[PDB]
């Protein structure tokens, strides 16, 4: 068939990234482009990207009543014409290359521009197909028979800007809008007085207005404690307006799709739109070219599934040495990777450390970046457990590859996981996953590949008065869950899990065909 597709989000690897979001908006659009579709990605210009060149095409977008000049920077990479929205609110943010902290200064603290920024980002994204000729400035323009894939709350306003501004005036009529939920807790909930600044018609105010007792913290600077009233408050919600006007909802896992429809816990407070409209779970793939331990760049000894035992223990020595753990091939090696906050479950895992080293015997590597509390405790691991544990906060792409090939077991104690990528990455490289039993972790870590202890407790949640000194005995589920899995290290069962893990196929080729048909339905052909 072949059609025009336009991805719209707040991250694209390698340019911006705080986690999986960026990686999906790198991989998915390329693997769609391989099928013959004309694909584009649209992201903000947070920093002066050396490979991003000004198209010279400007436009003016109305925000907070004042017109705003924005520019459009372009780059063709892997058949995907990516575009970057240039403006002072994105580019001139707090310094040190941004990288992480795209959306806030600290972690838990957001920038008060975010309403206007992602209001600006969306409207601007709707211009790009109309007024920028690609690949070269003497080439064709994208046009109007274009499907928009929009990713999380940050691009949750393009369905409603599309209909309320553009389709009104007789363009993008053939165009449809797909929403893609990577996460449910992040909904773009803002105070109601930011309404004027959005520049949507007054009819469309009804779709943004929203009532709940849980609001994210006051958007000032220092506070990060979600206020909780008895009578529900009035506020905004970009994500609901994404659900209202999206011509289809997708999400990143069959199991997670189920958990969002399930009710106000699993849908945060938005369950009744998803359950009404429907949500197709398409689990995330991975890049096979990049993640391939038979042919990997960052590996000393490269190995297949036929030659695992040798290859891993070789790359484990490298790892043990690099972290500075005793170089013992018979000592188990558990690896944790994920952001340092409540969702990924560091706080409990770290409380569970003595039992993992002192009682089970294993070594524990710990990558992560996020809140100041858990970052502090991570660095001091190698002090308190000398040569039996390390905590790396701040790290490189290269450092995550050696960690997988070296680790015996990989650990994810998540409260919930829409899909997760570190367990997919591990299984590719033979590291046997010990996981929390939620979402994409349930779908991906089958019993043939790994272990699945029961999930970790949260509150009524989106980080309320977080982890009650009591509920933080979630720890014991990890102590227990690991004890089973590691008792069995060096079994023929373990060698079967190793082989099983790597024979699984995580390439997008399959996933894309599902994504591709969901388009055809929403359109017509
Ligand atoms: C990894 C994660 O990256 C992005 O998450 C952002 C939020 O989008 C952003 O709003 C911000 O969250 C803060 C929030 O705004 C505020 O209310 C609160 O006070 O503090 C929060 C934390 O500071 O920060 C995070 C991190 O920068 C994406 O938007 C998320 O969707 C994404 N997680 C997803 C993505 C994938 C990819 O498929 C899944 O595989 C993964 O399991 C899932 O968690
Ligand atoms: N603290 C971090 N900051 C930014 N990226 C990270 C961090 N920890 C891991 N990563 C990278 O992000 C991805 C992990 O994302 P995923 O497992 O989908 O869950 P989440 O997106 O919630 O972190 C991996 O590709 C890994 O390279």
Author numbering: 18 to 542
Which sentences did the original study use to describe this structure?
The situation regarding ADP binding is very different for CpGBSSI, which is bound to acarbose with the adenine rotated almost 90 degrees and the ribose rotated slightly, although the phosphates make interactions fully equivalent to those in AtSSIV. The adenines are rotated toward the acceptor molecule compared to all other structures. Thus, it is possible that the whole region has simply evolved under different evolutionary constraints in such a way as not to favor the stacking interaction between that phenylalanine and the adenine.
Starch Synthases (SSs) transfer glucose from ADP-Glc donor to elongate pre-existing glucose chains via α-1,4-linkages. SSs are retaining glycosyltransferases classified within the GT5 family in the Carbohydrate Active Enzyme (CAZy) database. Here we present three new crystal structures of SSs of different families and origins: the crystal structure of the catalytic domain of SSIV from Arabidopsis thaliana (AtSSIV), of GBSS from Cyanobacterium sp. CLg1 (CLg1GBSS) and of GBSSI from the glaucophyte Cyanophora paradoxa (CpGBSSI). In all cases, they are in the closed conformation forming ternary complexes with ADP in the donor site and the inhibitor acarbose occupying the donor glucose and glucose acceptor sites that approximates the active site at the time of the reaction.
